[PDB]
Structure 1
């Protein structure tokens, strides 16, 4: 069918810049972390101009769906909903989605600005500091099911919980009642795991595929029981548990990707797939690596490939993205 994957997310503009460690210190940021800007960090946005930053579209789920749309090519192959502000920045994101052929229904929040994320590159790592702005007012429209009619893969990032957990809950609810449809979720960042524990619990029950990195699962283990790689991964599959797709995919930088699935009979299958080596000197920045991996994974899943094949496609998409500035598109 036309629409193959439908997602909700926070559309944001990324401002990328290479900054010295001193900048991280002055802004109270932890290298490699992802957080929402506190009042004191608001000054980071204007101050970046001294570093000649570059700007490009961002937003975790948007980045992912853009990979699926690029690989599927047909207009409306991927659908997306989110909220943008009534400003020139919002217009740039919108124009870009239209030119890429994605199907979108953006909600415009008058009086508010389009979200922005400062992507600070230092050493090799990326640190993210975001100001949601209009993204926080996002509410799914009553007829979203009509816009996404035909889609069998629904995706949401935990980052959408900040606006309200109702959005993702409604999407999962809908998918659940549809046979042959699956709901997929990304843990997004440690902060989401720690702040939205309750909503996540209800959400996990209705999740078919859970994606996240080692750091996110670690917090998920602690916040929940299991505690403890492989064990953490097998651990998380209970949260989704208690043939219906139940799979957990854990990414971890250059280390092998670990996927654990629970088959119909209760058999647990775990795959440990290596990630092709990429010389460090060839890496530009790792911003968007996980989003690219999820996008390649969902596109392959859309084509009926196997779990291992899914993972290989995700790895290939991520390897391309890490060789570019911010979230690029190529292949």
Structure 2
């Protein structure tokens, strides 16, 4: 059952399909995902009537899903995340429920909930988000009991956005025993650049480094150096120390994924797996598919493990993910 634990911001999605105008009413433009402002708050209610089949998710959330469905069993994945005393959450728990998820979401007093109006076109989406009724997770002191037995720990770097205590206090315990695993996902340029001093420690208490070129480069620019794939991949991994050892998955968009295993005698190997993705316009989902990669990676991770295997697995996670709607499981 429980064999993967995720910690992040529980966020809800409101995929719909709004005529251009609806869209223009809330000055959003097509091919945009941004942080909702004051006039875009009354929007949730709006798209809360249409015909929007809203699903649960986020980053750690979507990533887990995978993992979760990848399994098929109930409570095989738990996740902790801040929710508010809001019906946007009340549905955020029963919905995450039916999926066979064991997430624990504390409720944020008068904090309200948080979703992301996911306007579209015939496929082309525009998302408006409100990440703040989700930023007040203070890992419960007994959270280790709730995840008690789990050996695969995860959480999105976003987590820092509130306070790096949680994702801080998760790999510190995780490090205690029993031979579990800590994986962190670079998240955005903000997390990376707008975080530093926290990641330096997190980094070390990190067994798995998940991310793409974009920030690995904004991460590389954060540490003493220069430079490429092997460049940053092994240069970013090149930090100190501590088959679940010290990974760093350098997803190069389409270009081959690029990593490296760290073999007991301390010998650095570099894992390189392209990405046979045969598809058309049925792409577009830069997140939801990188959230997928992390999914198979932590699924096939709880099931045998294997360098290219796990990395070559999330491939058909995103591939199959970036395909269907915003995280259509």
Q: When the two structures are superposed, what TM-score results if normalisation uses the length of structure 1?
A: 0.87
Distance 1:231 1:124, change over 3 A: farther
Task: Give the 3-state SS of the residue equivalent to 1:31 in structure 2.
Answer: coil
Distance 1:49 1:5, change over 3 A: closer
Q: CA deviation at 1:120?
A: 5.9
Indicate the residue corresponding to 2:68 in structure 1.
69
Instruction: For residues 150-185 of structure 1, give each alpha carbon's deviation from its aligned partner in whole angstroms, at most 9, with x where no partner exists.
Output: 100100101111121101111010011114211111
Q: CA deviation at 1:252?
A: 2.4
Q: CA deviation at 1:319?
A: 0.9
CA contact (8 A) 2:282 2:324 kept: no
- Equivalent positions of 1:21-100 (< 5 A) are 36-37=35-36, 55-100=54-99
Structure 2: unaligned runs, 5 residues or longer: none
Distance 1:42 1:83, change over 3 A: same
Distance 1:284 1:238, change over 3 A: closer
Q: CA deviation at 1:92?
A: 1.3
* Number of equivalenced pairs: 328
Task: Give the 3-state SS of the residue equivalent to 1:49 in structure 2.
Answer: coil
CA contact (8 A) 1:284 1:325 kept: no
Q: CA deviation at 1:244?
A: 6.9
Report the Cα distance in structure 1 between the residues aligned to 2:71 and 2:109, rounded to whole angstroms. Answer: 33
- Whether 2:297 is the aligned partner of 1:301: answer no
- Identify the range of structure 1 (261-270 vs 17-26) with the bigger mean alpha-carbon deviation: 17-26
Q: CA deviation at 1:267?
A: 1.3
Report the Cα distance in structure 2 between the residues aligned to 1:82 and 1:29, rounded to whole angstroms. Answer: 28
- Whether 2:291 is the aligned partner of 1:291: answer yes
Instruction: For residues 279-322 of structure 1, give each alpha carbon's deviation from its aligned partner in whole angstroms, at most 9, with x where no partner exists.
Output: 22333644400111101111101112311100111001111111
- Identify the range of structure 1 (180-189 vs 219-228) with the bigger mean alpha-carbon deviation: 219-228
- Identify the range of structure 1 (167-176 vs 85-94) with the bigger mean alpha-carbon deviation: 85-94
- Identify the range of structure 1 (228-237 vs 45-54) with the bigger mean alpha-carbon deviation: 45-54
- Identify the range of structure 1 (19-28 vs 102-111) with the bigger mean alpha-carbon deviation: 19-28
Distance 1:241 1:119, change over 3 A: farther
Instruction: For residues 87-106 of structure 1, give each alpha carbon's deviation from its aligned partner in whole angstroms, at most 9, with x where no partner exists.
Output: 22101110012212211221
Q: CA deviation at 1:121?
A: 5.8
Indicate the residue corresponding to 1:264 in structure 2.
264
Distance 1:20 1:142, change over 3 A: same
CA contact (8 A) 1:7 1:156 kept: yes
Whichever structure has more strand as a proportion of its residues is 1
Q: CA deviation at 1:42?
A: 5.2
Give the alignment's Cα RMSD to 1 decimal: 3.1
Q: CA deviation at 1:234?
A: 1.1
CA contact (8 A) 1:126 1:287 kept: no
Instruction: For residues 81-133 of structure 1, give each alpha carbon's deviation from its aligned partner in whole angstroms, at most 9, with x where no partner exists.
Output: 11112122101110012212211221011212211224466898766553123
CA contact (8 A) 1:79 1:103 kept: yes
Task: Give the 3-state SS of the residue equivalent to 1:128 in structure 2.
Answer: strand
Indicate the residue corresponding to 2:110 in structure 1.
111
Structure 1: unaligned runs, 5 residues or longer: none
Q: CA deviation at 1:218?
A: 1.1
Indicate the residue corresponding to 2:126 in structure 1.
127
- Identify the range of structure 1 (250-259 vs 14-23) with the bigger mean alpha-carbon deviation: 14-23
Q: When the two structures are superposed, what TM-score results if normalisation uses the length of structure 2?
A: 0.87
Indicate the residue corresponding to 2:149 in structure 1.
150
